[PDB]
Write a protein that binds this DNA or RNA. Structure first.
Length: 1287
RNA sequence: AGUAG
C-alpha cells in the first residue's frame, strides 16, 4: 500500500521562451571563463605572485624542519638483531660517553647513555630477554626498556624534559634564499645516490638488472632498511606498559643511536612517540641546520638531532618508506620504458629513487598540499584554455617554511613555465624530456601518493568541515531574505529572470528550466517506458526495511538528541534493533516512511581523512532521514540506470568502458566533413573538430537547492500507471528540505574549552541557536542524493543541446556529455572554415544582417560560445562549472581520475600498488596475504607491468610475513614447530606464499595450498612418502579446525572490546545457540519477521568478526598492534583462545600421528581432480542455469518451518522455481566439482564459494587484445618484457 | 623541541 500525497501540477513551459532568451543572450559579447595558456602569461603570473607573497607573510630567516628522521651511513647495512643490538649499544654508548655535551638534548642523551652503561648483568638479561623469559627488575621493568628518574638527570636535561612537557614564511622572491635551499636538497639528494662501501627470466634481465641492481648499492637503499629498523624499535616502545619508560637502541656497529624518551602510548589517539637520533656525521639524510648540535671527538663528528615527536600515522608511514619509494621508482621505470622505448640510465633511476625516498621520509602536510595543487596546475598549463591564474594564485597561498618547500617551489616554477611555452614535456624530477603528457602527469601523481592520508591538524579540519556547511546555509538564508521564501523554495520563472538577469545564481533555480530539462530527459525515457517502470518496481518497495543488509549494516548512523543536546553516534544495526524492539512489525520502506514522516531530518559531520588539502566531510543521518534518502535514491537510481550519460549508475568497472565508447563516437564524428547549404545549391565546406572540457562543479551539494528536484520528479517520466510512487518521492524530497545539522562533540568541546572566541567563530556559533544544532535548508548534504543530482545535471546538459540545436539549425555540431556528480566531461564537436574564411565570414555577416543576431557568437571559435551557453543553462539549474579546476584542450581529457589522450586510457595504478603495503583486513595471516596479493592483481589489471607487479607482490609478501612473524626466523615461524619446509607448509599455518603474479591473476589467490595438496597427494600415492603424509595430516588438521579457504584456516579474533554495546544482552548465549541450531535456514537469508529478525540481529551482535569490526579505529591500530599480538593468544583452538604457536604445535601433533583413511583419500582425489584500451575479463564459465539467487536456494534446502519457508519465498526472484533450481544446482555442483551437496555438513562448506560470478574484472590491455580471458592472459604473457617483443 | 597552524 502506497500512501496518498499531493503532487505538483505543470506550469506549461515551452522551449521557445528559452530559445528566445538564448538568442538575446548570445547576441552580445560574453566574457569567457578561461584564460589562454601562454608562456608569458604563466611567467607574469608567477612573477606578480612572487612579488605579492612577501607583503602578506611575516619574513622568516630560519628554515624549518622537514626531515622526520635524520641519519647517515658510510658502509653497507646489515639487518639488526638482538646480539648485534647489544654489542652496538655497548660500543655506541662507550663512544658517546667521551663527548662533551653542550645543549640540553646532548646532556639528556649523555645521561641516558650513562644509565644504560651502568645497568646490571641481570638488568641486561631482562632487557634483551623475550617475553616468555622476561623477569622484572628494579630498573628493567619491561623488556627493551630501562628506568631513569630525577637524581639521575642533570638540570640541563630536566630543563629539556620540562620544555617538552609544557605563520612566518621564507623569502621565495630572493635568489639568496632560493639558491641556499636548492644547494641543500641537491646534496641530500646527491648523497642518497652515492654507492655505499618464465616471468623470472624476463625479470632477471630487465628489472633485476637495470632497477634492482642499480639501486641496491645506493645510500638510500640502506638508509631505508636502517629507518625500517629504527621505526620497528620505535613501534615496540610505544605500546601500553612500555611507552612510559626510557629506551636506548643502536644500529650499524654503533654508528647510529636511538634514544627513546617517555611518551604517551600510540594506542590512545593524539599521542606522539618522542625520540632522538645520535649518529655519525656522514652522507645521507642530514640537514645540519636542523640538528640539535654537532659534537666533535677529535676527528669524527657526531650529529645530535632534535627531539622528534612522531604520531602513529607518520610512524607507520616511515616504516614502509623504503617499500613506498621502491614501488614509486619501479613505476617511474616502467613509465620511462613505455615513453622513450628504452630503459633509463643508471643516474636517472638513482636520482628518481633518491627523490622518492626523500619525499617518503618527509611526511609533512605542507608538501602534501603543494603536491596536491601541482597535479591540478600541470593539467592547467598543458591545455589550450584553463584557469591557471587562479590555480597559481592559490599555489602562493602558502608559507614556505622549510628548504624542501622552497626547492619543490623552485622546481614547479620552472616546470610550469617551460610547459606553457611548448604547447616535449620536461620532467619534474629528472633531466629527461618526455614525449607524452601521460608520463609527466603520472610522474607527479606518483609523488602525490607518497604522502599518507590524514596528515592534517585534527582539530583544524574538524572546524573546516563545519564552516563550509554553515557558510552555505547562511548564504541560502540570505537569499531567502532577499527574494523571499517562496521564490527561493519554488524557484523563479523565466519572465523574472529576463527582468532581473541576476536570478541566474547558485542556490537559485528556474522553474521553466527544470520543467524543460525534465521534458528533454523524457524524450529519451518515453522510448523505454516499460524498462524504466520495471526497473523502478524491481527495487521491491514492499519488502521489509530492516531485512536489507544496507539497513542493518555496520556503518555509522545517528540516534537521538541526547539530554546533553548532541546527536547520538551509533551503528545502523543498533538502530534497527532499537526500532524492532519497540515495534510490533517489520515495516516496508514506504510504510516506515508514514510512521517517520513528521520526524525532522537530522545529520552530523565527520572527517573523511583524505590525502588532499582541506579534507572533506561525511554526513551521518538518523533513521527517518535514511528512509527518505533510500526512497529518493531507489527511485532515481532505477530511473537513471537507463540514461547512458549518467555514470554513477554504472557498477564501477563499466564507467571506463562507457567513457571510452563515448570518446570513440566523438572521434568517429570528427572524421567527417560538414556542408552548410548556402543560397541556391552552393555549399560551404567546413572541417569538423573536437574540444574536450574537463568540467568540475563548484560546491555541488553546498551551493544547491534540493527543491529543484521536486519539480524535476513531477515531470520526469517513469511509466507507472499512477503517480502514487512519484508523489511519495516528491513528499520525501520535501521532508529532506530542512535538516538539523549538529556540531561534533569534539568541536563543541574545543570551542567551549577555550577563551579566544575570535571572529569567524562567533558567526559560526550563531548558526546553532542552542549551540548544538542549526537548521540547514536547500543543501541536501554530500553523498546523499548523488544519483539524483547527476541525473539532473544530465537533463540540463540535454536541454542545452536542444537549445543550441534550435538556435543554429543550419550548423551540424556534436555534443557528448558525461556526468558523475561533481565531475563532468563535455565533448564539443564544432566546425571551422577550410582555408581562408572568405565564405564563412560572408555567410555569418549575411545571417547577422538578416536579423539572426546570435550568429555573432559563431564567427570564430564556435566551441567558446557552445561552452558559454552550456554553462549558463547549467547555472539556470543551480549548477556552477568550476572556473579553476576546469580544463579545455583539443587532445587531452581527464575524467574519473583517469587521463585520456583522445581514446587512450591512463589510470594511476600506483595508488593500488602502494595501498597493498597498508590497510590490510587484519583477519589473520591467510586473509591479509590474500588481500595484499589481491590488491597487487588489481594493479596488474589496471595497467601495471607483469614485472612492476611482481616486485610489489614480493614486497607485500615480505611485509606480511614480517608483520605476522612467519618470515624465516621469528615467533610463529612454521619451520620451528612443523617438520616440513617453509615452502611445504600450508599458507594458513604460516606457509610460504611466494607465488608469481602471472598465476595469482589467472588461477586465483589461494592455489598455493591447492598446489601443495596436489603435490602431497601425488607423492604419497606414488611413493608412500612419510613427509607427504605429514603434509596431508596438516591439511586434515586445518580441515577439522574449519577470503574462502576451502581446506580451512585458523580463526582469529584480534580485537575484543572491554565494554559490551547496547541491545547485546536481550537473549542469552544458550538461547542463541539453540536458535541457530534449530533455524538453520537463517544462516543464508535474513528473517522477514520481527521476532526472528530481532533474534538474528542480536545473534549477529555476538559474532567475533562483527565484534572486531565494530571496534576498529582505522587500519593504523591493526598494523600498529600486530607486532605485539603475534605473541598474544588471538587464535581459536579446542573451543578456546590460544596463540598461533599453540595451533602450530597442535597441527604438528596431529600430523605426526595422522593415518591415511579411505574417506580422507577419496575426498583428496575428489579435490585435486599502442592504444591503451580497456576490456573485460571472465574467468568463470556459464553456470547460470539458476533463476533465483544462491542464498535463496541454500536457505530453501534447509527450509522446514512455515515461517522459514515464507521467508525463503520472499527472498527469491522466482519463488515458483526454487525446487527445480535446487535439483539443477545439485547437478551443477556434482558435474563440475564432484561434491554432493545433499549430504549434511557438506553444503555448508561448499556454499561460501558458490557466491561468485560477480567479479566484473576490467583490464587495461594494449588494444589488440580481445575481451576473452585467454586473449588477456596471452597479452600478459607478451608483456613480460618491457622493451622487447616476445610473441 | 617536534607535529600542526
Amino acid at each position: 500500500y502506497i500512501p496518498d500525497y499531493k503532487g505538483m501540477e505543470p506550469i506549461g513551459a515551452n522551449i521557445e521562451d528559452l530559445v528566445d532568451y538564448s538568442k538575446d543572450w548570445l547576441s552580445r559579447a560574453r566574457n569567457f571563463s578561461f584564460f589562454e595558456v601562454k608562456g608569458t602569461a604563466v611567467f607574469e603570473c608567477f612573477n606578480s605572485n612572487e612579488a605579492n607573497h612577501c607583503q602578506r607573510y611575516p619574513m622568516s630567516r630560519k628554515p624549518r624542519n622537514f626531515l622526520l628522521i635524520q641519519c647517515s651511513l658510510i658502509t653497507s647495512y646489515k639487518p639488526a638483531t638482538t646480539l648485534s643490538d647489544q654489542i652496538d649499544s655497548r660500543r655506541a654508548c662507550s663512544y658517546i660517553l667521551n663527548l662533551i655535551p653542550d645543549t640540553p638534548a646532548s646532556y639528556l642523551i649523555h645521561d641516558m647513555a650513562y644509565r644504560y652503561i651502568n645497568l646490571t648483568r641481570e638488568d641486561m638479561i631482562n632487557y634483551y630477554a623475550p617475553r616468555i623469559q622476561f623477569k622484572q627488575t628494579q630498573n628493567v621493568r619491561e623488556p627493551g626498556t630501562f628506568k631513569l628518574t630525577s637524581s639521575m638527570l642533570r638540570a640541563e636535561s630536566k630543563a629539556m624534559l620540562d620544555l617538552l612537557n609544557n605563520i612566518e614564511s621564507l623569502n621565495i622572491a630572493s635568489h639568496i634564499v632560493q639558491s641556499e635551499s636548492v644547494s641543500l636538497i641537491t646534496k641530500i639528494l646527491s648523497d642518497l645516490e652515492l654507492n655505499i662501501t618464465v616471468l623470472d627470466k624476463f625479470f632477471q634481465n630487465e628489472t633485476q638488472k637495470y632497477l634492482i641492481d642499480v639501486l641496491k648499492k645506493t645510500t638510500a637503499w640502506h638508509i631505508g632498511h636502517l629507518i625500517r629498523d629504527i621505526t620497528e624499535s620505535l613501534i615496540a616502545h610505544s605500546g601500553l606498559k612500555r611507552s612510559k619508560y626510557w629506551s636506548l637502541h643502536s644500529y650499524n656497529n654503533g654508528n647510529v643511536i636511538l634514544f627513546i624518551l617517555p611518551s604517551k602510548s600510540l594506542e590512545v589517539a593524539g599521542s606522539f612517540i618522542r625520540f632522538i637520533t645520535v649518529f655519525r656525521i656522514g652522507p645521507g639524510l642530514v640537514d645540519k641546520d636542523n640538528l640539535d648540535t654537532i659534537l666533535i671527538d677529535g676527528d669524527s663528528q657526531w650529529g645530535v638531532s632534535k627531539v622528534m615527536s612522531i604520531d602513529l600515522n607518520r610512524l607507520l608511514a616511515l616504516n614502509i618508506a623504503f617499500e613506498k619509494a621502491l614501488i614509486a621508482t619501479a613505476t617511474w621505470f616502467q613509465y620511462y620504458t613505455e615513453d622513450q622505448g628504452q630503459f633509463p640510465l643508471q643516474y636517472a633511476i638513482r636520482s628518481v629513487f633518491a627523490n622518492h625516498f626523500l619525499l617518503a621520509i618527509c611526511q609533512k602536510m605542507k608538501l602534501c598540499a603543494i603536491f596536491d595543487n601541482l597535479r591540478y596546475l600541470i593539467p592547467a598549463v598543458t591545455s589550450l584554455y584553463s584557469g591557471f591564474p587562479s590555480l597559481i594564485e592559490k599555489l602562493f597561498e602558502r608559507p614556505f617554511k622549510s628548504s624542501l618547500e622552497v626547492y619543490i617551489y623552485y622546481n614547479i616554477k620552472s616546470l610550469l613555465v617551460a610547459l606553457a611555452q611548448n604547447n616535449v614535456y620536461p620532467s619534474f624530477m629528472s633531466r629527461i624530456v618526455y614525449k607524452h603528457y601521460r608520463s609527466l602527469i603520472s610522474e607527479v601523481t606518483t609523488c602525490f601518493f607518497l604522502f599518507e592520508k590524514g596528515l592534517h591538524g585534527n582539530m583544524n579540519e574538524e572546524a573546516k568541515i563545519h564552516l563550509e556547511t554553515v557558510e552555505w546555509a547562511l548564504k541560502f538564508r540570505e537569499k531567502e531574505e532577499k527574494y523571499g521564501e517562496s521564490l527561493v523554495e519554488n524557484g523563479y520563472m523565466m519572465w523574472e529572470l529576463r527582468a532581473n538577469a541576476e536570478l541566474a545564481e547558485q542556490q537559485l533555480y528556474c522553474q521553466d528550466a527544470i520543467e524543460l530539462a525534465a521534458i528533454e530527459l523524457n524524450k529519451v525515457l518515453a522510448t523505454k517506458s516499460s524498462v524504466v517502470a520495471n526497473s523502478i518496481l524491481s527495487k521491491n518497495w514492499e519488502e521489509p526495511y530492516f531485512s536489507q543488509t544496507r539497513n542493518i549494516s555496520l556503518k555509522g548512523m545517528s540516534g537521538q538528541v541526547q539530554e546533553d543536546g548532541h546527536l547520538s553516534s551509533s551503528v545502523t544495526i543498533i538502530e534497527a534493533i532499537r526500532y524492532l524492539s519497540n515495534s510490533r512489525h517489520n515495516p516496508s520502506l514506504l510504510k516506515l516512511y508514514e510512521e517517520t514522516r513528521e520526524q525532522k531530518a537530522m545529520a552530523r559531520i565527520v572527517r573523511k581523512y583524505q590525502r588532499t588539502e582541506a579534507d572533506r566531510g561525511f554526513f551521518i543521518t538518523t533513521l527517518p532521514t535514511r528512509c527518505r534518502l533510500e526512497i529518493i535514491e531507489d527511485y532515481y537510481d532505477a530511473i537513471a540506470k537507463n540514461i547512458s550519460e549518467e555514470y554513477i549508475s554504472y557498477g564501477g568497472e563499466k564507467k571506463i568502458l562507457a567513457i571510452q565508447g563515448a570518446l570513440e563516437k566523438a572521434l568517429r564524428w570528427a572524421s567527417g566533413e560538414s556542408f552548410i547549404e548556402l543560397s541556391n545549391h552552393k555549399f560551404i565546406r567546413m572541417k569538423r573538430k573536437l574540444m574536450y572540457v574537463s568540467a568540475d562543479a563548484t560546491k555541488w551539494s553546498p551551493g544547491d537547492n534540493s527543491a529543484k528536484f521536486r519539480r524535476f520528479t513531477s515531470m520526469l517520466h517513469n511509466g507507472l500507471p499512477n503517480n502514487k510512487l512519484k508523489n511519495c518521492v516528491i513528499d520525501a524530497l520535501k521532508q529532506v528540505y530542512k535538516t538539523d545539522f549538529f556540531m561534533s562533540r569534539k568541536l563543541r568541546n574545543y570551542i567551549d574549552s577555550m577563551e579566544s572566541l575570535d571572529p569567524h567563530i562567533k558567526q559560526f556559533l550563531d548558526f546553532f541557536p542552542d549551540g548544538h544544532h542549526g537548521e540547514v535548508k536547500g543543501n541536501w548534504l554530500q553523498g546523499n542524493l548523488n544519483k539524483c543530482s547527476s541525473l539532473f545535471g544530465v537533463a540540463m546538459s540535454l536541454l542545452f543541446k536542444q537549445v543550441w540545436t534550435n538556435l543554429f539549425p543550419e550548423l551540424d555540431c556534436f555534443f557528448e556529455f558525461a556526468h558523475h556528480s561533481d565531475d563532468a566531461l563535455f565533448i564539443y564537436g564544432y566546425l571551422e572554415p577550410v582555408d581562408d574564411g572568405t565564405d564563412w565570414f560572408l555567410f555569418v555577416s549575411q545571417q547577422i544582417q538578416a536579423g539572426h543576431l546570435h550568429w555573432f557568437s559563431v564567427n570564430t571559435e564556435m566551441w567558446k560560445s557552445m561552452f558559454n551557453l552550456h554553462e549558463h543553462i547549467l547555472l539556470l539549474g543551480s549548477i556552477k562549472i568550476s572556473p579553476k579546476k576546469t580544463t579545455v584542450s583539443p587532445t587531452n581529457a581527464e575524467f574519473l581520475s583517469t587521463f585520456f589522450e583522445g581514446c587512450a586510457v591512463s589510470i594511476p595504478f600506483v595508488k593500488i600498488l602502494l595501498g597493498s603495503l597498508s590497510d590490510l583486513p587484519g583477519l589473520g595471516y591467510f586473509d591479509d596475504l590474500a588481500a595484499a596479493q589481491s590488491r597487487c592483481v588489481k594493479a596488474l589489471d589496471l595497467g601495471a607491468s607483469p614485472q612492476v607487479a611482481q616486485l610489489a607482490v614480493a614486497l607485500c609478501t615480505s611485509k606480511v610475513e614480517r608483520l605476522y612473524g612467519t618470515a624465516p626466523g621469528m615467533v610463529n615461524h612454521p619451520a620451528a614447530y612443523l617438520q616440513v619446509k617453509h615452502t611445504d607448509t600450508p599458507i594458513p599455518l604460516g606457509g610460504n606464499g611466494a607465488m608469481s603474479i602471472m598465476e595469482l591473476a589467472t588461477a586465483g589467490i589461494g592455489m598455493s595450498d591447492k598446489n601443495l595438496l596436489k603435490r602431497a597427494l601425488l607423492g604419497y600415492s606414488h611413493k608412500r612418502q612419510k613427509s607427504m603424509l605429514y603434509i596431508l595430516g596438516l591439511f586434515k588438521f586445518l580441515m577439522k579446525l574449519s577470503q574462502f579457504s576451502f581446506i580451512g584456516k585458523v580463526q582469529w579474533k584480534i580485537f575484543t572490546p572491554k565494554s559490551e554495546f547496547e541491545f547485546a544482552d536481550m537473549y542469552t548465549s544458550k538461547f542463541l545457540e539453540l536458535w541457530s541450531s534449530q533455524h538453520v535456514t537463517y544462516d543464508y537469508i535474513i528473517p522477514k519477521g520481527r521476532d526472528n529478525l530481532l533474534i538474528y540481529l542480536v545473534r549477529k551482535l555476538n559474532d567475533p568478526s562483527i565484534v572486531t569490526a565494530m571496534t576498529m579505529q582505522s587500519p593504523l591500530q591493526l598494523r600498529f598492534r600486530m607486532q605485539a599480538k603475534q605473541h598474544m593468544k588471538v587464535c581459536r583452538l579446542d573451543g578456546e583462545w590460544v596463540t598461533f604457536r599453540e595451533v602450530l604445535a597442535a597441527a604438528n601433533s596431529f600430523a605426526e600421528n595422522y593415518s591415511a583413511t579411505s574417506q580422507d583419500m577419496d575426498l583428496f582425489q575428489t579435490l585435486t581432480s599502442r592504444a591503451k584500451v580497456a576490456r573485460t575479463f571472465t574467468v568463470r564459465e556459464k553456470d547460470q542455469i539458476i533463476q533465483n539467487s544462491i542464498p535463496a536456494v541454500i536457505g530453501y534446502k534447509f527450509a522446514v518451518t512455515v515461517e522459514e519457508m515464507s521467508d525463503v519465498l520472499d527472498t527469491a526472484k522466482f519463488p515458483d522455481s526454487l525446487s527445480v533450481d535446487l535439483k539443477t544446482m545439485k547437478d551443477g555442483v556434482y558435474r563440475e566439482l564432484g561434491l554432493d551437496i545433499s549430504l549434511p555438513d557438506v553444503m555448508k562448506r561448499i556454499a561460501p564459494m558458490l557466491y561468485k560470478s560477480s567479479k566484473s574484472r576490467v583490464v587495461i590491455v594494449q588494444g589488440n587484445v580481445e575481451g576473452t580471458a585467454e586473449a588477456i592472459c596471452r597479452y600478459w604473457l607478451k608483456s613480460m618484457s618491457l622493451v622487447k617483443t616476445i610473441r
